[PDB]
Specification:
Chains E, H: GO terms for molecular function: DNA binding; protein heterodimerization activity; RNA binding; structural constituent of chromatin. The complex is a heterododecamer, with two copies of chain A (103 residues), two copies of chain B, two copies of chain C (19 residues), two copies of chain D (198 residues), two copies of chain E (79 residues) and two copies of chain F (94 residues). Chain A is 58% helix and 2% strand. By secondary structure, chain A is mainly alpha-helical. Chain A starts with 8 loop residues before the first helix and ends in an 8-residue tail after the last helix. Chain B is mainly alpha-helical and 107 residues long. The longest helix of chain B is centred in the middle third of the chain and has 17 residues. Chain B is elongated, with a radius of gyration of 20 Å. Chain E has a single domain, classed as Orthogonal Bundle (Histone, subunit A). Chain E contains three helices and two strands; from the N terminus they run ααβαβ. By secondary structure, chain F is mainly alpha-helical. The chains are: A mainly alpha (103), B mainly alpha (107), C little secondary structure (19), D alpha+beta (198), E mainly alpha (79), F mainly alpha (94). Chains A and I meet through loops of A and loops of I. β1 of chain A pairs parallel with β1 of chain E, so a sheet runs across the interface. Chain A binds a DNA duplex (145 and 145 nucleotides) through α1, α2 and β1.
Chain lengths: 103, 107, 19, 198, 79, 94, 103, 79, 108, 94, 19, 198
DNA sequence: ATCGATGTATATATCTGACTCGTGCCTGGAGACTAGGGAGTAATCCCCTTGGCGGTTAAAACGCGGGGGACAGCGCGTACGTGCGTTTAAGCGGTGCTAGAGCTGTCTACGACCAATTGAGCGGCCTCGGCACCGGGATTCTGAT
DNA sequence: ATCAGAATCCCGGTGCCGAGGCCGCTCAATTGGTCGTAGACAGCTCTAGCACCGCTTAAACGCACGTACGCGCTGTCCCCCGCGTTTTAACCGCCAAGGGGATTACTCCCTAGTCTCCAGGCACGAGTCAGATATATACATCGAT
């Protein structure tokens, strides 16, 4: 007779644990690899050195944009009288921003 | 020769006035800057920075004598007429406001 | 303590429905 | 392998003095000199590089002449490295067995050769993994003479390949023992003459 | 081998559980990598343009703020 | 051995006039430095095109006054312009 | 007996008649009155004259804002799989614009 | 006689019809008037600030295009 | 003296160069404006104006008129991603909207 | 009344270059009069920002190139380079 | 007549899903 | 109600030449000379405007002193507006009886008087519908020597009030009819006695 | 699949009225020639970034079970659409007329600019104590009684 | 409603590195004066914006009809959450080394600057034909049947 929680109620403790802290949520190594990949996609093969503060800047602004995207899409999905999230709702919250997400 | 004194203490402001007067013409914003616009601009920056720091109301709840950027974010996202000024500007090591919707919480 | 500005440090004061 | 090549030629021409450009280009000899006759050299080094880059683009070099530009730029300027010397103990077949025995654990690797009359062979090694494309900026160089037990090594920042490099160098040669002498210097010809004399 | 799946199956869950999300579908873990990569393309495509303009070969942290400003989101704390 | 100046000293001085018992880390100094070198740039880059509209070649105090009444949202501007004006009257005393 | 269409089948001819039309859709007198009303609020009593091309300018910008607002809210309502629009849909598309509408 | 209800009901009907809206609810006729009002309050303040700076007493079409450009939408075609 | 040869004709450019150089000096974008910058900038504006007007003409002939009203400009700016992404924050005076019915509004 | 210079003639000339048989209304001339000043102001603002980052005190023809590859989205911007290069060489050879 | 500049006149090319 | 009245004061003093302001405030006399001692005349006129604005904001001004400022501005500058003369056809309570027929159907309207000693009443009238506040910028004026059967009127751009104003002047006076003389100009003092002395 | 009823794209006049092309004329391009001064370009140098390596370990991978939400189908009722008779005010031309935008003169305070102080702000430096981690109990929720 | 059973927190404790001063020092404010000059102020003109005035008619208002979509109710079923375990690379030091910012001296080109033109672009004017109605209709479409 173990203890199993209600499904769902771990998420509220997770939300209230993560909205407090100022840590980052993407590890520096895989984000570093996925950002060093793109310079070989844009600069015609030559590798550019990344100064190790600017990686933290991309690591900061990527989360500070993506969490806005996910929160606003969740607001849209809550508007749709359903409590979960979907690719349709990330699609919708990406569309109702015009070119402001893309420049 | 006389006993000199700064422009800032002659204007009673903390933000420097020689610095803003150096930047306001050698940053190519006009070929002429008047003798008063640096004083005014130092005043506006002074009022804005005091409006942010009065942060210290948020620091009482955390009981930390330092100010760390979580306090600054919880000040600026939670004060409207400074929120809209910095509405599309984020902050390093930011964090968001503690924010749950209404439909999510059970009975 | 020299500044203590007179304002109302109120809320996010949501738009999009009212006020 | 399409437009990284012309950018490699551009960034390697860019690392030359502005005054020795016609010399290294007439020593290079991929582009014709009539094509050289339409290039201004009072421009910026960026612009000179960009114009000769478009010239190399329209003449469509793939891989060889760029590595010749690399090894010739080192042939004029070898003191822009740090050179180690390995003492060992007990050319067509040499380079053939070398190519066949350096494609042993790592496959997509670029190898090139420059023969000199003083038994000197300069081997340029552009390194890479079986997954990664071969990088052109982490090169290594081997300077070897077939009458000495001494070899010169441009120890790149792609280390932990230099054991494999020296083992395939020894087995590619007619030798058995490999050893690193303790001396290294950023002037190649100093170690060259003090080990040819002594 | 694969380079896009570093943003791993609970890390996107960690981001959603920061942004007030109670339950996620099993398709967001693949779909949001597209948005993350599009945003990273539209930042680095200006960052390398800036630091290519100054004839340098590093990417200084000023030339990430100076690209994020051109995108529309200034990033403080890196002056 | 070359100097890149800051606003750290002035932020630290104005911290004394609002909260005399508090501290700020280095990253909070970074936030309150990049904030100032953003908002001063925004006000000047507004006032420049504003005085360039009316073909005046100067930037007086008045164009900064229009910049802060236009740029700052709402009632905050209503005090900031006051905080300018009293300030510049102090510059007409001495 | 009279002849009535099915409802909606008037509206589609209305759409295909209106998207081709480049006229203004707000009449000049009421919009001129409602734009002169706000200058009394904002200028502390004294009225300001309006160069009658600037009335056409605001008469253009009100449409350039409002038809995009309504189109995007209708798109977000189409995300909820319901054919009509609602104030929730306008509030949601009013929400996911950040501060760019007001900043 | 109320000066905000000049934007009448079939005008808003046809204005949604331009955007491609089939059916509009009975309560949009207040919310769209509200957002039209707040948009004009966020534009005309800037326009009269422009002209009050220039010591003029009418608002030129330039002095509302400049308020729009600072607000976030340029409008071409007005000199 | 010398020949009266405009600086535009030393590029074959239909946009003036002396105007751009005067605007870059007097408009206060720098202290000194180098001589290559207006030569470059007149070409960039020539290219952009031609890029609009060509698609404007293709919209014009597909309504069987000859003069271009702003409706063709709206229908030829917002019909290509290589220009729509440039002008997302610009409304056009009396432009209209693209012919745009959504997915599931149509009967059956 | 005195002098209000514009881009009215030049767009007419480039239209007669592209099209022999298309007229152009006065409102279209207004649109192509505001578009040219808008694009020119954006590119020159980016040129000034790039002058102000790298500490150089000028806007050379090199510094326009970064702005033109910056603003215009991708497959358009490259063509502008192969205009302007094809422009500027034709200046310097003459 | 020398215009019709060499570009790729293409679609709307909708965003928000990739492409 | 509060910003509007100081606003009207500020606008009306703003249209005054720089060397006469201390004159007309001396004729105004609402704020004392002690308040007047902070006018920094050696700056531009809008600074003078803001200074007298905050001065009259201090002493809690109201519309009587603002209208008095307006009518002294007329008494010292009558050559701005355009004056037309009317002629009637067959005094201490004239002030009280003229404010009866004005508020007959046009209710929310403001009227004021000031007296010259030649039986010349200067009358200020700022028109307004009974739906909104009357607007103090479209203000019309009537000067009338009660001895003469002639009257001078500068009515502003609010038309369809000239017949009501002249019929109110007819019924308030002891006359029966009014006529618009065909002469009019904006130089009042030259035509001030032009009906006399023929 | 008809056929009646209904918008509408098509088409010959016509009557514009916005092009647009003409035309002097200037005021802004353009040669011509300095100059100084900012940027190119070698040349060195130290710093900090990449490259490994070992080794922990705290997250990932996966799996598996179960249940709680998405979706689907179905009634039902209303709030919408839609024409219709009306009525009212928007827009039509037309007339003042006038406030007020613009345009010239002409000063005159005033800001650029050049030099000599000279100290205020900046780069190292160094304590030290505010804060980053345990830790152990002392709490607050919560899932099935 | 209770009660074990987890998360959490909080009172206390320890170690440590980043703030707060400290201190030399040096280059950029500052005083002081000169001098063009940008714009402040005053005055004049003409033009477009406002207030009517009638009118006339197209749209707005209300209303009656009616239906179909939004919503609530089952239901069901299956996809995702929550542990458990088990693998595995992220991270932390740690060494190194050398590529390359970052500075410095020096040196040309080149662009601001001033004349001296002088003519491309511009503000007026006239003749328009490219549209804007306007019949009308020939044909597509809606919807009963």
């Amino acid at each position: 007779k173990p203890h199993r929680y209600r499904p769902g109620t771990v998420a509220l403790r997770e939300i209230r644990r993560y909205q407090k802290s100022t840590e980052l949520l993407i590890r520096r190594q895989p984000f570093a690899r996925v950002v060093r990949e793109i310079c070989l996609l844009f600069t015609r093969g030559v590798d550019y050195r990344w100064q190790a503060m600017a990686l933290l800047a991309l690591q900061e602004a990527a989360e500070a944009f993506l969490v806005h995207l996910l929160e606003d899409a969740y607001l849209c999905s809550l508007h749709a009288r359903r409590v979960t999230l979907y690719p349709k709702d990330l699609q919708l919250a990406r569309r109702l921003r015009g070119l402001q997400g893309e420049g | 020769r006389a006993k000199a004194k700064t422009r800032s203490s002659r204007a009673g402001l903390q933000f420097p006035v020689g610095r803003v007067h150096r930047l306001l013409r050698k940053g190519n914003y006009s070929e002429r800057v008047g003798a008063g616009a640096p004083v005014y601009l130092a005043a506006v920056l002074e009022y804005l920075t005091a409006e942010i720091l009065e942060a210290g109301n948020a620091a009482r709840d955390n009981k930390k004598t330092r100010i760390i950027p979580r306090h600054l974010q919880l000040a600026i996202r939670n004060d409207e007429e400074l929120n809209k000024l910095l509405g599309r500007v984020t902050i390093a090591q930011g964090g968001v406001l503690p924010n749950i919707q209404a439909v999510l919480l059970p009975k | 303590n020299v500044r203590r500005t007179k304002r109302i440090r109120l809320k996010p004061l949501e738009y999009w429905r009212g006020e | 392998m399409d437009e990284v090549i012309v950018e490699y030629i551009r960034r390697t021409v860019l690392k030359i003095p502005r005054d020795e450009i016609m010399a290294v280009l007439q020593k290079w000899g991929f582009l014709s000199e009539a094509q050289l006759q339409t290039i201004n050299f009072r421009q910026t080094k960026e612009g000179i590089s960009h114009s000769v880059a478009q010239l190399c683009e329209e003449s469509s070099a793939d891989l060889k002449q760029a590595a010749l530009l690399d090894i010739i730029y080192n042939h004029i300027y070898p003191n822009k490295r740090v050179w180690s010397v390995y003492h060992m103990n007990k050319f067509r077949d040499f380079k053939k067995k070398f190519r066949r025995q350096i494609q042993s654990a790592l496959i997509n690797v670029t190898i090139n050769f420059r023969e000199y009359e003083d038994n000197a062979i300069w081997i340029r090694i552009a390194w890479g993994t079986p997954y990664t494309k071969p990088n052109q900026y982490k090169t290594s160089y081997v300077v070897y003479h077939s009458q000495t037990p001494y070899v010169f090594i441009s120890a790149s920042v792609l280390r932990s390949n230099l054991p494999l490099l020296c083992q395939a160098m020894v087995v590619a040669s007619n030798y058995h023992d490999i050893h690193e002498m303790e001396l290294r210097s950023h002037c190649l010809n100093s170690l060259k003459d003090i080990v040819f004399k002594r | 081998r694969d380079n896009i799946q570093g943003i791993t199956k609970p890390a996107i869950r960690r981001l959603a559980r920061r942004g007030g999300v109670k339950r996620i579908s099993g398709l967001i873990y693949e779909e949001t990598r597209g948005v993350l990569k599009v945003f990273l393309e539209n930042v680095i495509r200006d960052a390398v343009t800036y630091t290519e303009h100054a004839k340098r070969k590093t990417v200084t942290a000023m030339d990430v703020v100076y690209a994020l400003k051109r995108q529309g989101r200034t990033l403080y704390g890196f002056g | 051995r070359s100097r890149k100046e800051s606003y750290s000293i002035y932020v630290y001085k104005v911290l004394k006039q609002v909260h005399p018992d508090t501290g700020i880390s280095s990253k909070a100094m970074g936030i309150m430095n990049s904030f100032v070198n953003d908002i001063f740039e925004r006000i000047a880059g507004e006032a420049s095109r504003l005085a360039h509209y009316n073909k005046r070649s100067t930037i007086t105090s008045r164009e900064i006054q229009t910049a802060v009444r236009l740029l700052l949202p709402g009632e905050l501007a209503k005090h900031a312009v006051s905080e300018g004006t009293k300030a510049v009257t102090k510059y007409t005393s001495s």
